[PDB]
RNA sequence: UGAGUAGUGAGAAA
RNA sequence: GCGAUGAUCGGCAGUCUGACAAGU
C-alpha cells in the first residue's frame, strides 16, 4: 500500500511538530532531522520544497508507543518542537529518534538507559543526532548522571519495571520544572500480572497523586498493544 | 549455563514440550534457528523455544536480541535433545518456533503456555 | 557560612550561600525562581575546570562512585580558611566520603538542598559566565559518550565499522589506480609505445620510467630489479627501434612524477590490503578462517554491519550478492541463483559440477553459524576456533561428495 | 609544434580534482569519528588533510601547537582557536593507532596528488603560453586547453568556422 | 533436498 | 567619430525452499 514511491500529501499534525501524510492510506511522519537515512528501517517520505528536498520519516505505532498514543487521540503532549525532554527507558532510537524528530535542533533530548548491549546501539544513533544526549545509567539513581543532565520541560518513561513509579518521582522530582510534563507508558504485566489490568492503572495513578503528579488525561493504548494506557499528568511542587 | 536466561524449571518444561508436540502434529511448529529466526522476520511467531544446553550456545542467542525487539515471549528449555523429541524429529534442535494461528485447535493452551512465559520473563 | 557543591561536565563549582541554613528554609522555590536571586543567594568561591575529557572521564567517575577527588580535594581545600562552615552537597556518599576528609565543614544533603540543587540546575549557562549552553551541551554530550565507551567496554580493535570502510576504499582504490595507468601508458607510450605490451603490469611499467627517462638512458639503465632477464631486453632492443618521439624534460619531470604516483598508489593499496586482513582477523576470525577476508568483508558490508549479518538467514547469504539474478528468476518463473557473492571463496572453487551449489548451501550454513560467534560472542577469543572446525567439516562434505 | 600533451593534461587534471575530492571525503569521514567537527569547521578538503597531519590527536592541545595550527590557514575564520576549544570538548571516539597510523598516510596520500596537480596545473598554462600564446591569452590557459581537445587538436579548432568553435 | 555468478550573410546608426 | 578581421536576424523492486540425501 504505502510503497516508497507513492506520492503524498503532508499536512500538520494538531500538535506541533507532528505531520500527517495523506493517501489511500494514512500515515503519522515527523520531519528527519538526519535525512537520507533511516534509524530502523522504517519509511521514508521525499518532498521537494523551494528546490531544496527535505525528507520526512514514518512513525510506526507498532514499534513506539508515543505514536500509538497520538493515533489513539492524546489531548495534550508536552513533547514538542524546542522544549527539553528527559527520556527515560531509551533501549534504542526505535522512539527517541523520533522524539528526537519532533523537539528539533533546538530541543534536547536526554535519553536514559541502563542494559548495556541496547546502550551501544543507542550511543551509535545519538551520533547522528547531537540534540541526543545518550546516558547509559540506572534511573534508579538519578543522582549519578545528575551532572549530563539539565532541566527538562517533560520527562517521558516507557520503562517496563515494576517499580517506575519510584524512578520517575526522583528523576521528576530533579530536573523536572515546576508545572512541567510527566508522560509516562504504563504495561499492566510488568507491575503486576496477578491482577487485572484496569487495577494495575489504577494504583499507579495513586502513586502518581503522592508523588504531587496530577492526572490529566489517560489513554488506552488497543488495537495496536493489549494491557497498556499512557498516563499524562503535570508536575506541580507547590 | 548462565548466558541461557530466563530458563524454565522442570514443570514448566513439561508443559512447553508438550506443547511443541501438539504443534508439530497441526503443522503449527517451526524447527530451527534459522527457521525460526525467519519466523521473527515475517512477526508470525507465537514464541520461540530455545534449548539451554547447546554448545557454543551463542548460535542461538540471536533470537533473544530478535524476540526483544519485535516483543515476542522466549524461554529456554535445559536440553535439546528433548526438544527434537518434542519437535518430532530425529536430530536434536536447539530452537524452535510456534506460528501464530488464531484459528488453530490448541490455540487456547499456546497462550496458557504464553501468558506463563511472560510472567516467567 | 553555607557551601554547595555543584558538579557539572565542565568542572566542579562551589558556590557561597549568604544562609548558613538557606537549606532550612520551606520557601526556596520561591526564593530561586529566576536568575538574579540565585546569582545573589549564591557567588562562585572556586571553579576547577576540567582540562582534559581524559580528567574529566576520571572526576567523572570519581563522582559516579562516591569518591573525592584529587581536584575536588584540593579545590575544597581553598575554602578551609572559613572555620565553622556547612557543606550543602548533592548526593549522601559524597556527603559522607567528604565528611571523612576530616575538613572543618559540617556536610548537609537532605532533601530539602535538593531545591537549591534544583534551582541552580534551572540556569548554569547564566550562573556561569564564559560559558554558552550549546557549549555545555557539547561537554555533556562528549563526556557521557566518553563515559560510555569504558562502561560498556568499548575496545578500538571490534569495531566491525573499520571493515565497510576499508573494503570500499579497496575497490575505490582498485578504480582509481587502474585509470592513471591507462593514462600514464597513453602519454609516456607517446614517447615509447611498445612498452605497453612488453610490461602489462602497471606497477613495473610506472618503474621502468622511474629507472630510465628516455630511451637514450635505456642503453646504460639496468631494469633487472623491474623486470627478469628476458624481458628487460627487450625492451632495450625496442627503445633503439623505438617509434615514440623525443619529449622535454618538462614533459619528462611531470610523467616521471605521475609515475611516482603509480608505484605508490600500489605500496599503499598493499598496506591496505594488510591493514584490512589484521581487522577482520580481529573482528570476525572465525569467518576469515571459512570463508575467507575478501568475501568475509563483502558479506558484512553488503549488509551495512556485522550484527545486521549476524541477524540474516543462512539462505540470504547463500544468494547475497546476487539479487538481480534472484528477483529476474523469481519474477519469470525460472530457475534461482544457487552461489551469489560466495562463489568466489575458496571452498567453493575446489568444488566442481552440481557440487558447487551443494558446497554453497552447506558453506553459508556455517558461515552463519561462524557469523552469530563473532557478533554476539561477549568474551570470543581472537582465534578463531569455531571457523576452524566449520571448515572441518565442509571439507569433509566435499571430500565425501566429490569421491 | 606538439599539442598533444595539452589534451592529456587537461584530460588528467580533471580525473585528479574529481579523484582529490573522491579521497578527501574519505578522510574526512575516518578521522571524523576520532573528532568529527573539525570536518564542519575546516569545509575545504585539501586544508582539512593537513590539519589532520598536524593535529592526529585531538588530545594534544598546547598553546604552541596552537600557533603552529594557527599558522596553517589563516585565523580570521578563528578555526584555530575553535579546534582547540572543541578539541578538549568533543564526543569523537579514540581510534587505534593503526587507524591513525591509516588516516595520517591516507591523507598524506590526498596531498601528494594535488599536490602534483598543482604542478600539472602549472605545467599546462607554461605549455599553453608556449603553443598557443595567442588562444591562452585570449581566453586563458585552462579554457584554451579545454577547447582544443574539444575539436581533437590545435589544427582541427583553427579549419572550424566561427559558427562551429562558439557551439564546441 | 531443490535452485540463472553543416545557422544566415550586409547592413547598422542617424 | 561602425561593419566580411562579420551588421542583421525514489519507480520497475518482491530479500529463495525447508527433511530428507548417499550406499549394500
Known sequence: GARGGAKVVIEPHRHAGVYIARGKEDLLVTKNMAPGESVYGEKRISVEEPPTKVEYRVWNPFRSKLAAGIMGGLDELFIAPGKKVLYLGAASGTSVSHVSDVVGPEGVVYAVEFSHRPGRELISMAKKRPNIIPIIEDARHPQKYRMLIGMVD???????????????????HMFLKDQGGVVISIKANCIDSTVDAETVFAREVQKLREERIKPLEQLTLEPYERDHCIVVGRYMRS | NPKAFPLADAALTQQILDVVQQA??????????????????????????????????????????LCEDKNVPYVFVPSRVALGRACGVSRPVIAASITTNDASAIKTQIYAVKDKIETLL | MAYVLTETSAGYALLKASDKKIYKSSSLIQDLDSSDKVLKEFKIAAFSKFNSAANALEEANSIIEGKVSSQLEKLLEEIKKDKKSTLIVSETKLANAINKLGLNFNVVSDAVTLDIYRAIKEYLPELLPGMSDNDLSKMSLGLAHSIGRHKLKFSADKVDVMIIQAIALLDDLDKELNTYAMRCKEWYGWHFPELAKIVTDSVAYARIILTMGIRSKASETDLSEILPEEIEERVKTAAEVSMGTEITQTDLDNINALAEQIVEFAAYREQLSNYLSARMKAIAPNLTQLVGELVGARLIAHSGSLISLAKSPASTIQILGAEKALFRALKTKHDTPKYGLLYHASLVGQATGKNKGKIARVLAAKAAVSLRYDALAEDRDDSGDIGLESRAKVENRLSQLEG | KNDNHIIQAIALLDQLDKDINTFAMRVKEWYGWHFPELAKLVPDNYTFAKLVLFIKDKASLNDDSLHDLAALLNEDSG??????????????????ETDMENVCVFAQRVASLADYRRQLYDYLCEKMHTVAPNLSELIGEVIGARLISHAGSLTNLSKQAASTVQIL
Not at chain 1, 517533560?154 to 521528576?172: E, K, M, T, Y
Not at chain 2, 529466526?37 to 533470537?63: Q, V, Y
Not at chain 4, 578555526?79 to 569523537?92: E, K, L, T, Y
Open chain 1, 154 to 172: 517533560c520527562v517521558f518513561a516507557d520503562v517496563a519495571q515494576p517499580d517506575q513509579a519510584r524512578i520517575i518521582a526522583l528523576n521528576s
Open chain 4, 79 to 96: 578555526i584555530a582557536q575553535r579546534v582547540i576549544d572543541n578539541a578538549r570538548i568533543s564526543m569523537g571516539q579514540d581510534i587505534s
Open chain 2, 24 to 65: 508439530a502434529n497441526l503443522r503449527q511448529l517451526k524447527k530451527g534457528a534459522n527457521e525460526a529466526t525467519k519466523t521473527l522476520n515475517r512477526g508470525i511467531s507465537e514464541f520461540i523455544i530455545m534449548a539451554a544446553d547447546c554448545e557454543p550456545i551463542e548460535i542461538l542467542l540471536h533470537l533473544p536480541l
